[PDB]
Design a protein around this ligand. Sequence first.
Ligand SMILES: O=c1[nH]c(NCc2ccc(Cl)c(Cl)c2)nc2ncn(CCN3CCOCC3)c12
Ligand SMILES: [Mg+2]
Ligand SMILES: [Mg+2]
Ligand SMILES: [Zn+2]
Ligand SMILES: [Zn+2]
Ligand SMILES: [Zn+2]
Ligand SMILES: [Zn+2]
Length: 1094
Amino acid sequence: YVFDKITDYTSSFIVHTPRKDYAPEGEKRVELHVHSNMSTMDATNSISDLVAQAGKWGHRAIAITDHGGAQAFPEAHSAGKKAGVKILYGVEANVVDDGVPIAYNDTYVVFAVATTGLSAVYDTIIELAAVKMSFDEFIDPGHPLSRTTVDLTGITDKSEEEVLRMFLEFILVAHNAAFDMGFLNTSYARYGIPEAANPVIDTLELARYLYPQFKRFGLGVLSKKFRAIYDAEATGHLAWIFVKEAMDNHLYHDQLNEHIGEGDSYKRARPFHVTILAKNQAGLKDLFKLISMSNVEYFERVPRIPRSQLKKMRENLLIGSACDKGEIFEAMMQKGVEEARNRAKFYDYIEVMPKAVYAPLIEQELVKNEHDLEEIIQNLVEIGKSLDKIVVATGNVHYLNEEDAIYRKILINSMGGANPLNRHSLPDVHFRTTDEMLTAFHFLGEETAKEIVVENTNKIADICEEVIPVKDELYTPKIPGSEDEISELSYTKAKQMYGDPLPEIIQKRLKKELNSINGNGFSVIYLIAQKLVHKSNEDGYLVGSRGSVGSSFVATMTGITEVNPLAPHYYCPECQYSEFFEDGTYGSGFDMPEKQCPKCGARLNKDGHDIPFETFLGFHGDKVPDIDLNFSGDYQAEAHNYTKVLFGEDYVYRAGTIGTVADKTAYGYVKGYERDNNLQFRSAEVDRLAKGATGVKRTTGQHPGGIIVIPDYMDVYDFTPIQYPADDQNSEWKTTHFDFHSIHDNVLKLDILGHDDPTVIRMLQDLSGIDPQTIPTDDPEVMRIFAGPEVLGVSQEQIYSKTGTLGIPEFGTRFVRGMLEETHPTTFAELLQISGLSHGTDVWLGNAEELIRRGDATLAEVIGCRDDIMVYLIHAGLDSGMAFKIMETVRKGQWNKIPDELRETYLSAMKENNVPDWYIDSCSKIKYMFPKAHAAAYVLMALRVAYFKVYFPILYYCAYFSVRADDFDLVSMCKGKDAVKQAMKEITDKGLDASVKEKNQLTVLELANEMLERGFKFGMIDLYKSDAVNFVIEGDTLIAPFRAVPSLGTNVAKQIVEARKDGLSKEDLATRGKVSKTLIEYMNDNGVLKDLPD
DNA sequence: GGTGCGCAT
DNA sequence: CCATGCGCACC
Ligand SMILES: O=c1[nH]c(NCc2ccc(Cl)c(Cl)c2)nc2ncn(CCN3CCOCC3)c12
Ligand SMILES: [Mg+2]
Ligand SMILES: [Mg+2]
Ligand SMILES: [Zn+2]
Ligand SMILES: [Zn+2]
Ligand SMILES: [Zn+2]
Ligand SMILES: [Zn+2]
């Protein structure tokens, strides 16, 4: 089979009828237990392909019940709508019995019963020890003791009726008193002896209640902290202590049960599997609430649902017994039919899987043979008919086909001893057809098998109505007076900048933008962005932007963005005079020559970059505005908390991401598996096995800057469950359970990202007092750096770079530096072009490097950004509608993918208007192109930083190292230029195959070399001068911070800062600061502690 | 802490 | 031969 590389499922080398459901059309099964790759490291198939398989097989419905989550619900909805298959939305929850009594039957005979296994039904007592606080006896099973028993219990090969009578004549006490009491009572009933229901105590539960701080409550562990005979004396020696603690720290038997299931009880309980299915939409909301609470309130190494919570919310939730790890199967195989018929009273349907699923039980000795397994399954079918419950065969599907099992194994093997499944062999939990299931349950008879496989499953499916896990429309928050507020802000700023009578250009722009925004109900997005940016500016932080927000003039006037999308123009700061150039004569208003106001003597401010708003709001303005804001890294938490304030702590959630097994991790898993199992896989197989195990959920994290806001007239459970990122209960924010991609079309996702540029600019403003917004972004001298390194005062030979853009965001990279060297930009428009080429896909390597090198087009003419295509075509003479459509087709790399007719219309229109041939050839090769407003914002930040680099070199270098540089040698740096150059040469001679740490070191070293070439120098740390994290400026020298010293750590860094304000001996330092000898050794050889006179 | 590695704009 | 940045897993 071609999987990329061809495979026969036996091995893979480097160069068919599918499974069918043979049952009749109306007699198809419904699979009610399906695990997708969203079950963390358990299942390997996407819910989409399972739903597609069910659709092909003719199944009317299928259930998606993952282990503790609903993260496959949106994909399942899409797949069920594509395949015409009804989806039942469920979960495989770990339920913990809320109240497990300590005393059962409301002088102590602490007893114990070594036995022949764990199933009171299917094995029996071999020893019956007890101490009245002594009665010890051996019982002989007819069968010879298995080597397991001979070892677990130190017993090698009177009648019970007699030993049982002796013990009956002799307050019962036991560790795991349920297990011993069940064994004793079954033995009693075996001879018609009275049940002997005297008061009982389970020392396990008493220890759990009295010492919750403990982690494991087994007898050995507990015995340490504080044969049947030994077991008994041990329990007795404890039980005395436990009862004394119960009487003192908290006096009767009954009172031993008063405080049960209260507190962290969920944390110590042992969970069991239950299946929860939503019966209707309200059931789905209740299921989301249950998942959210199991993730947020009752999480202990897994999401847990206390049984009391599942009881409250079960009017719309079908509860099923799940698998052999469910409590009904556990009771029937280990406690008896009466305990299973009492537990089954709580379920709504009973699940029985094929004997192939249960094989690991027979391998683990839990079930002795296939006969016992058949008996257990048959009893469960009968118990269900007796209590009038639906009995269904489920299958416990974990992957699609029988050949996919290996993938699961590999994943499981990757967990080592963490996964209990690694002890035994995995079952056959592929997706079985109706005929396969009928065959697997033929030992119950054809009628019963056909009932529990086909009829009952379809009855369960019919019980549930159609459910929609994902909404259809967008629900934005409501802020009263938002449209009016946005209009007022925009017009007030426009009047202040361009006088009360606004230029007709500005009038038209504002009117169209505001009609698109307020008309579509998008004003709340603008208002939230405005508030966030306004609060950021008050705190003294500039907010940059990513994407196309800068294309909006309402975004400029409301203060959200610094990019002015108007046509190039002058305006007078004093008298409000303005003059626009809509003729395409200038790329930007920044490139316009200096001019003085005709009306008065003040100079004219030049602005405008000719960015249409259609790129942001789409043609017709119906598109949802998307405003990604690069707030400072320091201020990002403040912006998140401000969203919390704006909308309330219960309606804002950090957007959640699901991290899966990618190629690197999957390859590592396969390699570890083949090492442990000592095989030799062929590279192609290994690659097939890695592919099969890829995409499986591995963890959950948070989105970098995404806050999801829920309308205050709804609740989060109408959209998604919630959780803590990575299941960290100490997290300050809750994330959405669903991946944000499935919900961001229905609720607002505020991208409040963090960028180092606003941090660097804030530091530069602090170090110089210059206001960041007063910096000239049209300065000619600052563009000389983009040309060559001479403006800096150094040569190409000394800074190893042709361009002086080292350390300039988005322009200091070797690729971009090479492009700058080959193009020599000299204007803001050309800088925006350089950006659209350094970042686009297929825009420079084979489309424009050549056109520029051969003179076909200049840098200013080639296609750099997506807005440029529309601007050029509209200037060429095409209709705005034609250019918009063509600009979209090109930016999406669909020039070739569009039909012949469309390509034809576009080509005809362009050629009819004198659009060159090289321009259409370029369009043909472009895969992705990014917006003009994005480039304008990033170029404005880069120019603001470069201004300081050129005119305030010491301040710029201090800010860069303090904010952007994290890994410093500091030894070559402190030595001088020669050592820095030697380190750079070492990293360079390490070649293309160099570590990420080495590349970061090379970047910092390049910056340090450039700073040294210019006359500034770095200095070793000073205990009474260096800062914790920031470089200090002293003269023309940069004093390195403590964090710069290799491994000085950051917490201990602040420590030495805290200590130095309190007040010798060189030992005092290590003592207070918590300096590790090793780092003191560093500060000593490098001269730092030399000062110390000790 | 440090280092991958996955994810996102 | 895209840049930058965040967050969790694992050592
Ligand atoms: O891949 C990306 N790289 C960058 N780089 C940042 C950048 C910085 C500066 C400029 Cl001027 C530009 Cl255009 C881009 N931003 C991005 N924002 C979104 N993306 C991903 C684009 N994806 C992938 C392709 O399909 C569209 C969605 C990216
Ligand atoms: Mg015992
Ligand atoms: Mg966004
Ligand atoms: Zn599972
Ligand atoms: Zn299960
Ligand atoms: Zn299962
Ligand atoms: Zn004027």
